């Protein structure tokens, strides 16, 4: 019946479930699974996969699926930390957006229309090919999809200068539960607000984003330097880092990746300056001479080169390859936001725990700059002025280490518990792109839970959105009153008597 409907509407790229591991079905399913944690045979699998190739095909796919009792799952880049783009407890149809990867750059307006299956890498590549003086603010990872990423905000190395990806969206096409094709004018300002950070898989299917392209100099300066030190020095480096990072002028970003193994600690310092190396080095010589950076550490390159470089890619060309796997290890990750400086002992204890688990690592970013100049309700992402750091904890492993899975997860749980007193509280804050089901989830098939969905969902909802939660609920009720777009942590609509 679904097939018949799709055909009647001219949607032809559809593949039904197959038990054949070599089937095209399995191939399409796995192409965009970015967390191996959700690849095994015990995981839920879609009853069919649809690859729409135009806005009409996307609209008609939604309309046809609704005539059945299927749960809709949308996938862009497949980076969901919890696999929420390609898993469901209820029978589901996977709408994979990989064929919707057209990027149209308008150099006369310095804007771009970006189909929602496009990855960050594809977008960055298109921009740098078009111009040496334009860039865009989003995350570091080139295989992340614009569909999920911009829907949830999108933080990166230029956010201290330009905010989130979603903060630079000026129009969008949203396909709603009825298949309506809505631009900013059609959807209204509440829904246009909601989609710019309120989370993917909740409002409808974004077909395309219209973004403002942003000025960058023809040469920027970056560094990527790993310090191999002991815990005393590593602790003093991280403790000073937090102040340097949040306080730097907006034209600078300094972030850190860290890990350890017994007495050996490694800290990778990632630096970005919107300008030339003389100014970059003068600034860090003054503010953070403890890093011991030398002239040869500072590299001048184009903006496009800088984003490929910071992502650990070999070439700018690699930005344009959506299936170049970033890691291929199963992982679990959690995140904290902070409001008060971290005491030295927090870094010391964090490093002690990393030293006991070499499969763990941390990623540290400062806010401030433009992030403090954007109001908390400009878009749904609320963590602006007053927010100091974002702190990510990751544990990752390969197939040969699967037996240790339980141990790895226990380690991560204990790290998060250790950090509790030092980070944001009441509530402990989060970030919707860093979706975390440990916070809880709604079973939309459970009547008693659904009756109390607003209060239950406040647990994660207020962590992700703070006071923006209420306006999000109103927007959800307007655009998807029947809850066609849902997942364990989707914004609840209000139900009528
Ligand atoms: C995997 C990963 C993620 C990541 C990162 C590095 C890696 C290796 N670095 C990030 C960074 O530097 N800054 C940042 O803000 N986030 C970073 N992330 C996390 C990433 O933002 C999120 O995982 C993001 O949501 C992923 O988006 P993607 O599009 O790749 O993922 P998805 O699984 O397919 O979708 C996620 C959710 O959104 C819904 N979705 C997908 N497409 C649409 C459209 N077009 N319309 C509406 N909803 C959509 C999915 O259904 C799912 O709910
Ligand atoms: C449904 O969509 C999928 C995914 O886009 C289609 O598969 C893709 O088809 C294109 C065109 O055949 C393939 O590109 C080709 O690649 C070869 C190298 O193998 C290259 O030499 C050609 O220039 C050509 O571009 C592409 O590989 C393939 N992608 C995947 C992931 O399989 C599929 O054809 C569509 N199905 C239907 C029924 O329309
Ligand atoms: C190259 O610089 C960076 C590298 C990694 C990160 C953290 C990144 C991450 C990196 C991985 O490799 C990975 O798989 C195991 C999982 C995760 C999920 C969290 N995510 C955001 C941030 C960076 O700035
Ligand atoms: C609904 O959810 C509640 C709380 O999670 C659970 O106790 C109960 O068993 C569920 N009810 C049904 C009928 O599944
Ligand atoms: Mg076979």
Swiss-Prot record:
Essential to the formation of benzophenanthridine alkaloids in the response of plants to pathogenic attack. Catalyzes the stereospecific conversion of the N-methyl moiety of (S)-reticuline into the berberine bridge carbon of (S)-scoulerine. This is Reticuline oxidase. Gene3D superfamilies: 3.30.465.10, 3.40.462.20, Uridine Diphospho-n-acetylenolpyruvylglucosamine Reductase, domain 2 (3.30.43.10). It comes from Eschscholzia californica. Belongs to the oxygen-dependent FAD-linked oxidoreductase family. GO terms for biological process: alkaloid metabolic process. The gene is BBE1. Pfam families: BBE, FAD_binding_4. One of its GO terms (molecular function) is reticuline oxidase activity.
């Amino acid at each position: 019946d679904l097939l018949s409907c799709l055909t009647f509407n001219g949607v032809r790229n559809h593949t039904v479930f197959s038990a054949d591991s070599d089937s095209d079905f399995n191939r399409f399913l796995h192409l965009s699974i970015q967390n191996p944690l959700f690849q095994n045979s015990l995981i839920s699998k879609p009853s069919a996969i649809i690859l729409p190739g135009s806005k009409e095909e996307l609209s008609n796919t939604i309309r046809c699926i609704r005539k059945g009792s299927w749960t809709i799952r949308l996938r862009s880049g497949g980076h969901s930390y919890e696999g929420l783009s390609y898993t469901s407890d209820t029978p589901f149809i996977l709408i994979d957006l990989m064929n919707l990867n057209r990027v149209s750059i308008d150099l006369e307006s310095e804007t771009a229309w970006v189909e929602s299956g496009s990855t960050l890498g594809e977008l960055y590549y298109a921009i740098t090919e078009s111009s040496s003086k334009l860039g865009f603010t989003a995350g570091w990872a080139p295989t992340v999809g614009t569909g999920g990423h911009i829907s949830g905000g999108g933080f990166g190395m230029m956010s201290r200068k330009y905010g989130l990806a979603a903060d630079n969206v000026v129009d969008a096409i949203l396909i709603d539960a009825n298949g309506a094709i809505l631009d900013r004018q059609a959807m209204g300002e509440d829904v246009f607000w909601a989609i710019r950070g309120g989370g993917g898989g909740v409002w409808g299917a974004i077909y395309a984003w219209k973004i403002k392209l942003l000025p960058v100099p023809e040469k920027v300066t970056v560094f990527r330097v790993t310090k191999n030190v002991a815990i005393d020095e590593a602790t003093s480096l991280l403790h000073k880092w937090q102040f340097v990072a949040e306080e730097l002028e907006e034209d600078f970003t300094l972030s850190v990746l860290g890990g350890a193994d017994e007495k050996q600690v490694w800290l990778t310092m990632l630096g970005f300056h919107f300008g030339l190396k003389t100014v970059a080095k003068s600034t860090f010589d003054l503010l953070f001479p403890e890093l011991g950076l030398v002239e040869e550490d500072y590299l001048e390159m184009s903006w496009g080169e800088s984003f490929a470089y910071l992502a650990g890619l070999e070439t700018v060309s690699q930005l344009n390859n959506r299936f170049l796997k970033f890691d291929e290890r199963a992982f679990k990750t959690k995140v904290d936001l902070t409001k008060e400086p971290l005491p030295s002992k927090a870094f010391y204890g964090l490093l002690e725990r990393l030293s006991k688990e070499p499969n763990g690592f941390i990623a540290l970013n400062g806010f401030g700059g433009q992030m403090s100049k954007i109001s908390s309700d400009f878009t749904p992402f609320p963590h602006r002025s007053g927010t100091r750091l974002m702190v990510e904890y990751i544990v990752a492993w390969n197939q040969s280490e699967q037996k240790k899975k339980t141990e790895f997860l226990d380690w991560l749980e204990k790290v998060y518990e250790f950090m509790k007193p030092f980070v944001s509280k009441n509530p402990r804050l989060g970030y919707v792109n860093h979706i975390d089901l440990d916070l809880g989830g709604i079973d939309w098939g459970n009547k008693t839970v659904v009756n109390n969905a607003i209060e239950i969902s406040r647990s994660w909802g207020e962590s992700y959105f703070l006071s923006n939660y209420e306006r999000l609920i109103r927007a959800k009720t307007l655009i998807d009153p029947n809850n066609v777009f849902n997942h364990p942590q989707s914004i609840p609509p209000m139900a009528n008597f």
